[PDB]
Amino acid sequence: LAQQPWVEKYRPKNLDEVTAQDHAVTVLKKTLKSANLPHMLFYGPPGTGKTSTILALTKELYGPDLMKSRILELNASDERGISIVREKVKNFARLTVSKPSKHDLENYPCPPYKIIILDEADSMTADAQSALRRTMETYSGVTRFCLICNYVTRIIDPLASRCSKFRFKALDASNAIDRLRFISEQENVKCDDGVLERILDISAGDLRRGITLLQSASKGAQYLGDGKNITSTQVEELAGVVPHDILIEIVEKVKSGDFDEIKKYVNTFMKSGWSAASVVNQLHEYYITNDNFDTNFKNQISWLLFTTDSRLNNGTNEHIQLLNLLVKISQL
Amino acid sequence: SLWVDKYRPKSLNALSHNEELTNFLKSLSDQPRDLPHLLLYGPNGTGKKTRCMALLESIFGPGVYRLKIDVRQFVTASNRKLELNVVSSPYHLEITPSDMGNNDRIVIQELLKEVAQMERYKCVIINEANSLTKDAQAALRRTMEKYSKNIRLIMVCDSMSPIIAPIKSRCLLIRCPAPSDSEISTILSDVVTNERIQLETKDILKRIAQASNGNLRVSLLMLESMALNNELALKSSSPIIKPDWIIVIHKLTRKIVKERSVNSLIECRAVLYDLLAHCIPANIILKELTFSLLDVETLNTTNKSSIIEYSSVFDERLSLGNKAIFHLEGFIAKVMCCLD
Amino acid sequence: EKNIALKPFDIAHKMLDGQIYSDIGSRNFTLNDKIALYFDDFDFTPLMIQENYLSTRPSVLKPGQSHLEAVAEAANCISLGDIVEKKIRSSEQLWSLLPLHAVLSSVYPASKVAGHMAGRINFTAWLGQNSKSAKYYRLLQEIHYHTRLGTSTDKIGLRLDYLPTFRKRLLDPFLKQGADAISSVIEVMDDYYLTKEDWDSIMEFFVGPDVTTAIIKKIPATVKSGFTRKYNSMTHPV
Amino acid sequence: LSLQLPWVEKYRPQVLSDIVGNKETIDRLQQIAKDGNMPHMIISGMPGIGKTTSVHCLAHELLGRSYADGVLELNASDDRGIDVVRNQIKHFAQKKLHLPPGKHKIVILDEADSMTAGAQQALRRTMELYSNSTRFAFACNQSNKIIEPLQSRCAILRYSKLSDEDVLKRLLQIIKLEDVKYTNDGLEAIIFTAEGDMRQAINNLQSTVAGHGLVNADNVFKIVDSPHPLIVKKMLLASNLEDSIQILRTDLWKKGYSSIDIVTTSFRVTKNLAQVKESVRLEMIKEIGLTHMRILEGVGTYLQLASMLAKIHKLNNK
Amino acid sequence: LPWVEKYRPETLDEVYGQNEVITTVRKFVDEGKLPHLLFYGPPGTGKTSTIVALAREIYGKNYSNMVLELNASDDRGIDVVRNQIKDFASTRQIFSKGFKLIILDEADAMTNAAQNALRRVIERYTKNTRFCVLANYAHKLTPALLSRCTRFRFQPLPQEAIERRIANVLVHEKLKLSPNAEKALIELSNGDMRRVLNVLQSCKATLDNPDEDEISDDVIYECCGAPRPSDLKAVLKSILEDDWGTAHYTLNKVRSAKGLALIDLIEGIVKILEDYELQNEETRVHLLTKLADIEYSISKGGNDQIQGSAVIGAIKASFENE
Ligand SMILES: Nc1nc2c(ncn2[C@@H]2O[C@H](COP(=O)(O)OP(=O)(O)O)[C@@H](O)[C@H]2O)c(=O)[nH]1
Ligand SMILES: Nc1ncnc2c1ncn2[C@@H]1O[C@H](COP(=O)(O)OP(=O)(O)O)[C@@H](O)[C@H]1O
Ligand SMILES: Nc1ncnc2c1ncn2[C@@H]1O[C@H](COP(=O)(O)OP(=O)(O)O)[C@@H](O)[C@H]1O
């Protein structure tokens, strides 16, 4: 059997297989009915189907055979400056347009232009986006650009004005869980109760991350070889998520407020290898959404967590930061 | 050789602690062709490198231990020459790109590429993956995407937080917790039975484990040092032997606690200079000083909270700074002020 | 000729004078003059200020403020200035922050601890310590390169953990066995591809109660001569 | 009739006496040129102050006619490589030339602090080998980064930022050379804007002459693209934070001034607030520098300036 | 043709707002002399418009064969534009007398070496060719090239002139613009006429009926990809009035569904809060300091959810001071 990531294995092939993006699919179908395809700005929460929808539109345009020749897929966060991405775009545009075959012409409405897709375009700097706008202006005759992003507001106005914008709604929990369940049933993945829900919660609704985590869990279960169902602890381990019992013990140690007990527990915890950033994130999730804490406590603890996260992002010692954060929370 | 190196497990069957991880590694090695990229994260001196070498031995045979060290020369675009120490075997390579600092990225983009041109696959071990720059990590992700056919990466780190998300998604996360005190005691008992060391009681070994704070390498070296000091006859009254820098740091902590003045700060400056001039890292000094100060029994809760807050602040400043003595002296001065 | 080397001392002495920080002293000697004093020698003034700001008797202490609080504030500012200097001297070349660095490294810490020089203006000791640290790090890198195939550790782990036991396996047997431990020491060195130069370098890394200079000097010269003769008389692994 | 030339290049210092700042360094260079026998030198200072210009003036005063081929300028950070520039230096040194007996060839190396220890050792060896023929002058931002043998063999020279008196003297000399109507406030404004940058001050004076002719404060601040110092002073000294924010939003942010110019002018004005206590001025300068560092890292939004004003007001009102 | 080129004024008399610079250049135009000019300032002020208007006024109808306009940041490279400049300088015509005119737009994007090469070429062809340098900032240009040209600064256009130009464009294109849409467009463009014209053309393109339909503020905000004031006001109201859970849910939902980045949300919230009448100065101090700290931390990366909750907590704690 061939090996392929399940993210690219289960991408929808045509626009009719997009589940929850009714508005974007309808607008894209209307645009496809028109003889001219403008520049496109696909924006929305991650794992909603932006890349899937643009790939489906590209296939319905060029045919399954000629799609690969007419498409340049790039990631906008590529390092070594904007120069590498812009030069690749220039080389793709200067390259001669492949002649469609008789079968492709008679079966699909092949347009003269080629499509360049940029992923995570919102991560580009302002100068990089201005250079991309210049390149799009120069080669507007033969190349149509599709910019995929999470935040449309991170794209400069001069670049955004040239693009017709498609907003993708966040996938409902039922739709994402049904997609994950269908993928698991197709691949004969055995899962316990609430395992897919735990995967969705860890991925924060991102279906790409959920599918990747499900594939990783299936691989781990195959490695184990006992034939038992995948459990929540396994997927927590694979995603680097601290178990809930340890977080509850941390919360209780904070509540007691003894400095020596907290220091001893943090010393014991740092030996287990759990990531401190995951601990800070889960403490934030627990405390902010908890109804047993008043407004002042949350006001203080949000700043405490923000300071701890900012210091952790600088590449510091996890033990000291975690102990300081826990002590400061316990003094609240 | 030293007991820490003579009795290092040379195979997956020779591992004695973290049984679940050993079984997982055996299952992983059972299918060499479908071996994923691995990222082993855990505390220092727990056996990550030993487990990586044992997995490589399970895959490619004992020949992975025929290690030869060479120096590879690279040219970066400003026409600058860099030298990287590469430990290679007929089956795998080991690199520590962080030794090149910000110049790690280009080095990787060379060396891995060269191996991909030379090549079923060759395993590349990357040490201190958490200290790689973000550009180097992006280049590593690119090489994972491109040369996955011939390159399988095994990264080792103490903290997975500095690792970027795209690297994490494409690699298998392996958590390596530090062994419990019972496992450390069992390992030390095996070592002393192999070396014919007299023990009044096994409790001494337990104490050594409690002194190592879960660091198996530290516990083994401490056991060897204690055996050497006591003429290969360990007694229940044999004191725990600590390294010189730890003793100096404890003396500095006692000095700081006892007296708080400008002259004491001046002498602490000389102590810190002595520590820094002999290859003791600033972060290590700060961590040891802070956790020695927090262990003083005469300090109240407020003093310890102030100490830990200043430790966090000056640890961030050390990570963002260039001159270590500046931040260390600032931290010590703040602690001295807070103790009064 | 020699006054060029005296210029940093003069700058440090002038900037730590408490007179120029009172109201009248500030009016006569403005902040522009102090930043100009920094820019007279922008290589040594931060180092001299960091070196000599603990040797003053302050006359600018606020009411209710002790000397220790002032030196703590000065050290806080000095560390901030060190961060600024790192950002300036990085590949970004943010030289426009040179004035700010001044205030963060020379002017503000001097303001907090300005007074009378209790002693003498000492030259900065950071340069020599930095050179010493670089030399010892090169030595540690060489030792790690030699012993990498036998030890499962990084360079820092080699310094922190392995070297204390290498001391007991390479130097301690001499003090108790005379020349009888030469064979064992040579065997231990051969197990890790350690040369006589590496043996000399290893003993220089220890601090505090583990310093080996006096201990090695107390070793009889006959024992050392026998050790080097036996090492030179036999071939060793490479 | 001839092609026009900018004043920065026309009145650039050509001889040693034309340099105004660095009295000690210029005096030592003049003595060395007077008695001949130029020794090996290193010169350290912040970039953009004219170390290369001073060593070129010394080379002129030494050689004269033979300056065209007797001086080689090279950058140690050149992308061609350290080995290539070392070979070029060797070729230049081995090139025989009939100089006067008391003179030697001159090599001016830039960014010598960026070289590795081995490269510096090789350069020292080459300098020793060709000592009788060519003498070396190095320019570095960090004097301490140079290895000890090079520092011991080479003389020490330090170039520093020009003081306001030197800038005023040079501006007066230029005004005497080219007939320009000027006023005291205009020259004070030019000196205030150019913080020891002689080239920037000369360019600003030339632009003011070209645009308005007469050099007064209003014309200088119209030519200069930085915010007007009085507006920044009003923003900083406002007793109400709302007034400061209002001034920042209307007179500075909406006028197209970049955040870098705003923070630089705030630093300049705060440094000269004689009516404010010096400790308060130092606190304000610390806050302004923190926001300047934040802006230089990419985040140069209006919120950073507003927070700077808020912190300054908090310091002012205690 | 794009609306930027088609609405460029034909003569110098039609340029608004820049009367001082217009008169200063018109002195040279009347004198029949052209020195090296360098127009610097924000985009959309009319530098290209003014220079092409004066070029047409000077050279008559034959300016096509007498002047050459090029973009200095062109993707073909510095070599191609340099060769074209040298070819135009070397080319001579029967009626070519005095100075040929070459315009280089956005010259500030060139590197130092490219600017030096351009200066050398200009000095080579000074006797028979004159050049214009259009840049956003003069300081971006190297001083060596900067000193060679007479500098002219452009100041952002007054709001009344922008409104008049917008009305003229609307009546020429038969477009109907709501007053709220006009205010939103003026606020977003902050005086950049290029942005105004581009957004107007794109909004006309998006209309299903280019004549009957009217462009609303929603269309303008969608076209510019900017946060709507209504969304930011709703988020601020939820933060100020609702409890922590409701505020957290509202902030996350709004900034995820509408695709608003946290930094843009912070900027918009600050802009809205500027108009608030606060009884205590400490509220404003805390708001500004904490929000700037959060934005600076955002610029370095970090945890997004934690930063959002930090924004919520900072606003709540600051407004606890009434
Ligand atoms: N007997 C025994 N010793 C072990 C085992 N795991 C680790 N060790 C010892 O502990 C040390 C671990 O150091 P290392 O492999 O570098 O761990 P790392 O630095 O955290 O990656 C080695 O020197 C081994 O001798 C084990 O399973 N059994
Ligand atoms: N509307 C949808 N219907 C079905 N599957 C979807 C949908 N949206 C996302 N997916 C799944 O997500 C995976 C890839 O997500 P992707 O489209 O790359 O996320 P993004 O929107 O960030 O580009 C595919 O395997 C696909 O099955
Ligand atoms: N001051 C002005 N007076 C009249 N029209 C203007 C003015 N500024 C800009 N415009 C209009 O805006 C359009 C684009 O401005 P443009 O001159 O291209 O800006 P830039 O200077 O950035 O090139 C022109 O068509 C012009 O009609």
PDB file of N, CA and C in Angstrom, chain A residues 231-251:
ATOM      1  N   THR A 231      -6.627   5.410  22.831  1.00  0.00           N
ATOM      2  CA  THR A 231      -7.167   6.079  24.003  1.00  0.00           C
ATOM      3  C   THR A 231      -6.737   7.541  24.024  1.00  0.00           C
ATOM      4  N   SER A 232      -7.406   8.316  24.882  1.00  0.00           N
ATOM      5  CA  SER A 232      -7.166   9.756  24.931  1.00  0.00           C
ATOM      6  C   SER A 232      -5.757  10.074  25.419  1.00  0.00           C
ATOM      7  N   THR A 233      -5.220   9.256  26.327  1.00  0.00           N
ATOM      8  CA  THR A 233      -3.880   9.520  26.844  1.00  0.00           C
ATOM      9  C   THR A 233      -2.834   9.420  25.741  1.00  0.00           C
ATOM     10  N   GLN A 234      -3.028   8.501  24.791  1.00  0.00           N
ATOM     11  CA  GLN A 234      -2.081   8.364  23.688  1.00  0.00           C
ATOM     12  C   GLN A 234      -2.062   9.613  22.814  1.00  0.00           C
ATOM     13  N   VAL A 235      -3.242  10.135  22.468  1.00  0.00           N
ATOM     14  CA  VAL A 235      -3.286  11.326  21.624  1.00  0.00           C
ATOM     15  C   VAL A 235      -2.810  12.553  22.394  1.00  0.00           C
ATOM     16  N   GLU A 236      -3.017  12.584  23.714  1.00  0.00           N
ATOM     17  CA  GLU A 236      -2.438  13.654  24.520  1.00  0.00           C
ATOM     18  C   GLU A 236      -0.916  13.582  24.515  1.00  0.00           C
ATOM     19  N   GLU A 237      -0.365  12.371  24.619  1.00  0.00           N
ATOM     20  CA  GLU A 237       1.083  12.199  24.568  1.00  0.00           C
ATOM     21  C   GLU A 237       1.646  12.615  23.215  1.00  0.00           C
ATOM     22  N   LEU A 238       0.955  12.259  22.131  1.00  0.00           N
ATOM     23  CA  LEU A 238       1.466  12.560  20.799  1.00  0.00           C
ATOM     24  C   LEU A 238       1.470  14.056  20.513  1.00  0.00           C
ATOM     25  N   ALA A 239       0.518  14.797  21.071  1.00  0.00           N
ATOM     26  CA  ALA A 239       0.424  16.233  20.853  1.00  0.00           C
ATOM     27  C   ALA A 239       1.172  17.047  21.900  1.00  0.00           C
ATOM     28  N   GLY A 240       1.848  16.397  22.840  1.00  0.00           N
ATOM     29  CA  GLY A 240       2.548  17.116  23.892  1.00  0.00           C
ATOM     30  C   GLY A 240       1.631  17.865  24.833  1.00  0.00           C
ATOM     31  N   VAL A 241       0.537  17.238  25.255  1.00  0.00           N
ATOM     32  CA  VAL A 241      -0.461  17.863  26.115  1.00  0.00           C
ATOM     33  C   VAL A 241      -0.366  17.233  27.496  1.00  0.00           C
ATOM     34  N   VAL A 242      -0.227  18.073  28.513  1.00  0.00           N
ATOM     35  CA  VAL A 242      -0.120  17.595  29.897  1.00  0.00           C
ATOM     36  C   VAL A 242      -1.436  16.946  30.309  1.00  0.00           C
ATOM     37  N   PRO A 243      -1.409  15.810  31.006  1.00  0.00           N
ATOM     38  CA  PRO A 243      -2.661  15.186  31.449  1.00  0.00           C
ATOM     39  C   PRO A 243      -3.426  16.078  32.415  1.00  0.00           C
ATOM     40  N   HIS A 244      -4.752  15.909  32.417  1.00  0.00           N
ATOM     41  CA  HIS A 244      -5.617  16.774  33.213  1.00  0.00           C
ATOM     42  C   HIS A 244      -5.407  16.577  34.709  1.00  0.00           C
ATOM     43  N   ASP A 245      -5.054  15.362  35.139  1.00  0.00           N
ATOM     44  CA  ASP A 245      -4.827  15.123  36.563  1.00  0.00           C
ATOM     45  C   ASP A 245      -3.630  15.917  37.071  1.00  0.00           C
ATOM     46  N   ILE A 246      -2.567  16.004  36.268  1.00  0.00           N
ATOM     47  CA  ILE A 246      -1.400  16.791  36.659  1.00  0.00           C
ATOM     48  C   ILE A 246      -1.763  18.267  36.755  1.00  0.00           C
ATOM     49  N   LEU A 247      -2.579  18.756  35.817  1.00  0.00           N
ATOM     50  CA  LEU A 247      -3.026  20.144  35.874  1.00  0.00           C
ATOM     51  C   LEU A 247      -3.881  20.401  37.109  1.00  0.00           C
ATOM     52  N   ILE A 248      -4.741  19.446  37.467  1.00  0.00           N
ATOM     53  CA  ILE A 248      -5.563  19.594  38.666  1.00  0.00           C
ATOM     54  C   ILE A 248      -4.687  19.610  39.912  1.00  0.00           C
ATOM     55  N   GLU A 249      -3.655  18.764  39.941  1.00  0.00           N
ATOM     56  CA  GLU A 249      -2.723  18.771  41.065  1.00  0.00           C
ATOM     57  C   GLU A 249      -1.981  20.100  41.155  1.00  0.00           C
ATOM     58  N   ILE A 250      -1.589  20.658  40.007  1.00  0.00           N
ATOM     59  CA  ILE A 250      -0.951  21.974  39.986  1.00  0.00           C
ATOM     60  C   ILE A 250      -1.897  23.031  40.540  1.00  0.00           C
ATOM     61  N   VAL A 251      -3.166  22.976  40.132  1.00  0.00           N
ATOM     62  CA  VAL A 251      -4.154  23.947  40.596  1.00  0.00           C
ATOM     63  C   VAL A 251      -4.346  23.834  42.103  1.00  0.00           C
TER      64      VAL A 251
END
